[PDB]
Amino acid sequence: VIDAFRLINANMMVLGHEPRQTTSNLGHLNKPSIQALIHGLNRHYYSITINYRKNELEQKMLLNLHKKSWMEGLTLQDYSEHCKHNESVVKEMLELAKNYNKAVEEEDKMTPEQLAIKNVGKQDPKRHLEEHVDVLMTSNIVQCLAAMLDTVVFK
Amino acid sequence: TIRDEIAGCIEKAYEKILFTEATRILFFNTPKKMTDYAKKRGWVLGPNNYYSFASQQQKPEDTTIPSTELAKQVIEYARQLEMIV
């Protein structure tokens, strides 16, 4: 993001305005160009490159601060609260997944027949198509957080 | 090799068996083999009768013992889920 600029001298318009040396960073900076308004600043102005520096120690903790933010304080609290969740209304949330698996599949079982009508994968789409990946991933989250029960509750 | 199998296969599991009734299988008259069985089995020796106490035997529950392998099986099961992944 951000940006950076520099003012070229306007009284130099009689002499050569065309440096620089080590044109590498110049080439990567002027790119992409990227519309018009951006190019309207090539005259009277020129940009200047930006690069981060580390400072990797504090950056390492700065990663772990946001990542650990999702984690709990004691780490046994919200996971055991998800174990309280592991049977809620989770049998009812699994009934939510069961309705997605009936309703999406009986209409996705007509698709193998419809492929013979259109012959074969021409546009399309419907849809009503796939979406079982998210259902399997949520069910896998359910079974893993539920597998934590035998680990936590026991000892 | 049959006679020791009388002792092994009678219990478990029978509640009780009368004296002379087991004497009908051991044959003889009043053998010392049934005394040696009163040692080997142990098990119980009762008056004019016998007993499988106690009780039938050892009373497996097994309570929290199988919960360890019930957690353990799910450990490697989840590992198979992660191998997909």
UniProtKB/Swiss-Prot annotation, chain A:
Gene Ontology CC entries for this record: cytosol; cytosolic proteasome complex; extracellular region; ficolin-1-rich granule lumen; nucleoplasm; nucleus; proteasome accessory complex; proteasome complex
Tissue-wise expression: Widely expressed. Highest levels in heart and skeletal muscle.
Residue stretches in coiled coil: none
One biological process term in Gene Ontology: protein deubiquitination
EC nos: 3.4.19.-
A GO molecular-function annotation: proteasome binding
Residues with Phosphoserine modification: 69
Protein family (similarity comment): Belongs to the peptidase M67A family. PSMD14 subfamily.
Protein name: 26S proteasome non-ATPase regulatory subunit 14
Organism: Homo sapiens (Human)
Region of the whole protein represented: 156 to 310 of 310
From Swiss-Prot, chain B:
Membrane-spanning intervals of the chain: none
Highest taxon listed in the record's lineage: Eukaryota
Crosslinked positions (Glycyl lysine isopeptide (Lys-Gly) (interchain with G-Cter in SUMO2)): 32
Quaternary organization: Component of the 19S proteasome regulatory particle complex. The 26S proteasome consists of a 20S core particle (CP) and two 19S regulatory subunits (RP). The regulatory particle is made of a lid composed of 9 subunits including PSMD8, a base containing 6 ATPases and few additional components. Interacts with DDI2. Interacts with TASOR.
Function field: Component of the 26S proteasome, a multiprotein complex involved in the ATP-dependent degradation of ubiquitinated proteins. This complex plays a key role in the maintenance of protein homeostasis by removing misfolded or damaged proteins, which could impair cellular functions, and by removing proteins whose functions are no longer required. Therefore, the proteasome participates in numerous cellular processes, including cell cycle progression, apoptosis, or DNA damage repair.
Protein family (similarity comment): Belongs to the proteasome subunit S14 family.
Name listed for the protein in its UniProt record: 26S proteasome non-ATPase regulatory subunit 8
Species: Homo sapiens
Lineage start: Eukaryota, Metazoa, Chordata, Craniata, Vertebrata
Gene transcribed to yield this protein: PSMD8
Coverage span on the entire protein: 266 to 350 of 350
